[PDB]
Amino acid sequence: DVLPPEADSSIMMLTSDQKPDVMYADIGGMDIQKQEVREAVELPLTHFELYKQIGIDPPRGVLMYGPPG
Amino acid sequence: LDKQIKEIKEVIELPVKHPELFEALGIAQPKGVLLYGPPGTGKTLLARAVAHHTDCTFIRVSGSELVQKFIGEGARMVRELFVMAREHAPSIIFMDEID
Amino acid sequence: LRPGRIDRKIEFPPPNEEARLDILKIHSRKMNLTRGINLRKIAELMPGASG
Amino acid sequence: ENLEEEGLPKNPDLRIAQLRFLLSLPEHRGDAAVRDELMAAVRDNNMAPYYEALCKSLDWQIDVDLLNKMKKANEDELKRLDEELEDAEKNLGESEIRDAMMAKAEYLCRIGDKEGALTAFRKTYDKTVALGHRLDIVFYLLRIGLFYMDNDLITRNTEKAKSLIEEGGDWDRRNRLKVYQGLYCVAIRDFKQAAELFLDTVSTFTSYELMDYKTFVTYTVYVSMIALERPDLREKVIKGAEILEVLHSLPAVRQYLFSLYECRYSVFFQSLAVVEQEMKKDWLFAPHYRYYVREMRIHAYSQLLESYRSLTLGYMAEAFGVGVEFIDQELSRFIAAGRLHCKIDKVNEIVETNRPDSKNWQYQETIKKGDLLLNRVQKLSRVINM
Amino acid sequence: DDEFEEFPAEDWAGLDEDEDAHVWEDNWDDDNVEDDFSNQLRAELEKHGY
Numbered sequence A: 001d002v003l004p005p006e007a008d009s010s011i012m013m014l015t016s017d018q019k020p021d022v023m024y025a026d027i028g029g030m031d032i033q034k035q036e037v038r039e040a041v042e043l044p045l046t047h048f049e050l051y052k053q054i055g056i057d058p059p060r061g062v063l064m065y066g067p068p069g
Numbered sequence B: 001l002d003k004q005i006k007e008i009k010e011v012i013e014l015p016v017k018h019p020e021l022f023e024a025l026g027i028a029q030p031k032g033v034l035l036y037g038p039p040g041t042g043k044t045l046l047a048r049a050v051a052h053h054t055d056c057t058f059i060r061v062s063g064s065e066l067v068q069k070f071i072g073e074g075a076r077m078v079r080e081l082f083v084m085a086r087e088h089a090p091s092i093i094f095m096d097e098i099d
Numbered sequence C: 001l002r003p004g005r006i007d008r009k010i011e012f013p014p015p016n017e018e019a020r021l022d023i024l025k026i027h028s029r030k031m032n033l034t035r036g037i038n039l040r041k042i043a044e045l046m047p048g049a050s051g
Numbered sequence D: 001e002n003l004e005e006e007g008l009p010k011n012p013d014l015r016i017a018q019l020r021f022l023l024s025l026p027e028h029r030g031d032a033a034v035r036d037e038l039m040a041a042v043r044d045n046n047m048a049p050y051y052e053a054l055c056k057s058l059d060w061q062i063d064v065d066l067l068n069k070m071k072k073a074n075e076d077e078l079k080r081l082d083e084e085l086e087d088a089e090k091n092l093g094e095s096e097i098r099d100a101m102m103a104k105a106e107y108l109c110r111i112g113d114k115e116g117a118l119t120a121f122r123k124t125y126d127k128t129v130a131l132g133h134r135l136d137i138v139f140y141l142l143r144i145g146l147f148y149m150d151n152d153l154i155t156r157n158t159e160k161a162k163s164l165i166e167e168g169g170d171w172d173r174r175n176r177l178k179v180y181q182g183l184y185c186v187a188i189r190d191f192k193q194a195a196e197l198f199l200d201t202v203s204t205f206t207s208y209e210l211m212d213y214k215t216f217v218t219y220t221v222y223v224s225m226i227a228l229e230r231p232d233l234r235e236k237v238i239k240g241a242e243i244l245e246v247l248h249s250l251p252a253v254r255q256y257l258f259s260l261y262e263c264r265y266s267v268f269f270q271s272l273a274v275v276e277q278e279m280k281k282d283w284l285f286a287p288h289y290r291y292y293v294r295e296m297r298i299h300a301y302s303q304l305l306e307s308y309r310s311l312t313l314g315y316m317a318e319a320f321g322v323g324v325e326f327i328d329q330e331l332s333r334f335i336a337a338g339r340l341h342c343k344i345d346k347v348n349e350i351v352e353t354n355r356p357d358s359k360n361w362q363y364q365e366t367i368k369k370g371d372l373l374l375n376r377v378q379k380l381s382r383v384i385n386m
Numbered sequence E: 001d002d003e004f005e006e007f008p009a010e011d012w013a014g015l016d017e018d019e020d021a022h023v024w025e026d027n028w029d030d031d032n033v034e035d036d037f038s039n040q041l042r043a044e045l046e047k048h049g050y
């Protein structure tokens, strides 16, 4: 037998009730970081064709690093 | 890097493709190349290009312990890489100093 | 650095004004470029820049 | 100022193809200026194989002295390139090998040796490891295909070019291929695709080896008026910033475009007549000059009738600056063809418009194109059995 | 194969110089015999005294 791809996964997605209550407006003073994450995570997710038309290769992953807190 | 492309060809391309030029000259075939300059100047770009154009297998030796299982279960010497380098001759062993 | 070990040492200087234009001419092909871009001026706008 | 230097190499020079076509026309066969400029291209580039075909097809007198001095230099240069390839294959490396056989291909292509150039380019492609260098050979073959209208060459290399641009995301080369594709689409009467491809590259045009930018915008406007709807025309052509800038230096093409959009039908017919003569002398638009003018006349008649329930013959004749008899004959021809949704009441000289549904037009195409497909299926089974 | 030499193969005498060599959706309307539209329009501009 072949199982459905979404089956057999010990890790589950985030449900609507598991969505954190933290807003963007809750975060203060991270415009450079907010922009880069938007341009590299959420904008390619919705504008993948505009990246292809322009010629930018969207980053597959994003590494966020820095001092704790 | 037109000047640099010519320089690296005379040392990595010609000995592989035309060993007779060096035998006629009576000189030893070159074996070691050092590319030096500021980071991002094309050293890794040119080293990969020559290996691509000469059909020489390109091996990057970063000393990573993540790749040691492929090099060999011993991992006591870096010369254990020569076993997999000989099997893929012609080969180019490339190491980049991060510094 | 001892003679006989490294048979050739090749220098990779930072690209000058003309070499920066060639590198600029190479990586800009992968983009949807409007006709008439003055890549020469942008190269002049980047002194001492790497490829 | 460096626009022409940005374009790909001018091999084969597509101007010669236009020059050769112009002499094939009965009107321009005896044109001394067109002969002189063609001979200048032949003499400068030593196109000995092209001179033989030029004199054979056009029944010219072959200058033995000029041919021999052109053949000798072709032999001398080919010997030089053969020596360079021999030197490269013995001492130099693979890249210097490839540059040696590349220059042999360009010289053969330059002198008009089409069969030799295709073989030389094929051999160069086999041992060319650089992807962009491979795609330059394909663009060379596409230019050769356009030069001789070799459809098998164009279609095969256009498909090969599409693959190469996918592996290496070369948007610059992708933009050039659209201009190459659009030129072929013009040559094969695919104005719907030619308009789409030209409009995409109107702001990214660097293919100066094929044509001038003013000529490219001229073609873009021409294919747009016949293949674009009125809402699509105003957003892309009428309000196009790049097209409008060029139209400042091209008052005739701008007048032709805006006459139809602004419903100036008398001027549009005058402009359409001017456009017709341009396309007759143009090697790309010549096979389709009758079709394009007829379709443009259909557009103007349909545009005038679209907004009105009934228009008198005299008003339509007055609008187009033509006689009533002209408009009656033109309509009766077009209504019979099914391309105008109207009928003429000749006793009262009133043209009443109809609104046939899209279902009927789709059904005829399904019957038409399905029958064309079925004929291929029937013919293929005939080949299979025996 | 039993080729049809019985039927008189009328001599070709055709133009082997790529007379058409095209692939379009060709229709009968392009072959209608008529003057160019410029001549038709020029022959009617002066019919109105212009």
Ligand SMILES: Nc1ncnc2c1ncn2[C@@H]1O[C@H](COP(=O)(O)OP(=O)(O)O)[C@@H](O)[C@H]1O
Residues within 6 Å of the ligand: B001, B038, B039, B040, B041, B042, B043, B044, B045, B046, B096, C015, C023, C026, C050, C051
């Ligand atoms: N001279 C150059 N020409 C074209 N691209 C270059 C050049 N130098 C650097 N690059 C680009 O920079 C990137 C990384 O360069 P790299 O070769 O890693 O630098 P380094 O020479 O310090 O190793 C490559 O992907 C390459 O595309």
Ligand SMILES: [Mg+2]
Residues within 6 Å of the ligand: B039, B040, B044, B096
């Ligand atoms: Mg580096």
